[PDB]
Chain A
Amino acid sequence: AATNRPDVLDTALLRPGRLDKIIYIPPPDHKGRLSILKVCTKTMPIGPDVSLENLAAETCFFSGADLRNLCTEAALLALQENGLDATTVKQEHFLKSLKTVKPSLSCKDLALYENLFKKEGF
């Protein structure tokens, strides 16, 4: 079972005998976002001036889909700028893509899962 709003589900479903094991899937940390970025880096010809550790500290409050959109925009910006036979993607393409892609997480729903946390289901 998978849900994104736990607040609404009936307490009768989480009794012992219906749904026992509850696993919390966390939003990514700084070390978590460095490994998400290495999956998307794996098939792009990224030149030798891009440090993904410094870019992981700048990308705060991103989910996994917004980090996937960030690599899509920086590859598309290197297509329109250096030409149709463009071969390299640089660091300044990545800094310009942060102005358009904006974070989708906040401290409202992140602290919701901290209340729900113990709240009742403990």
Chain B
Amino acid sequence: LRHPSIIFIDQLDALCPKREGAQNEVEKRVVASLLTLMDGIGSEVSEGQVLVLGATNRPHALDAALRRPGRFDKEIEIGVPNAQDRLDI
């Protein structure tokens, strides 16, 4: 409409944990349709107004196809603190 859209997606793991089972349900078919909107619409037509944010709960339940470069290529690790790191809490 006027593209102010800062896209943050919560419950990253709860979208599809490695596409679940996909027996009679459409979690596999809403990724490649969304892949037109990002690889195609999220990048080709955005010049900086489209950026997808998402944090993961389980590190070993996300889909491995979402770690391809150009889409979710980088990674910033936030984890346990050190003794000096938990001092200034």
The answer to whether any beta carbons of A and B sit under 8 Å apart in the complex is no
B: which residues have CB within 8 A of A?
A: none
A: which residues have CB within 8 A of B?
A: none
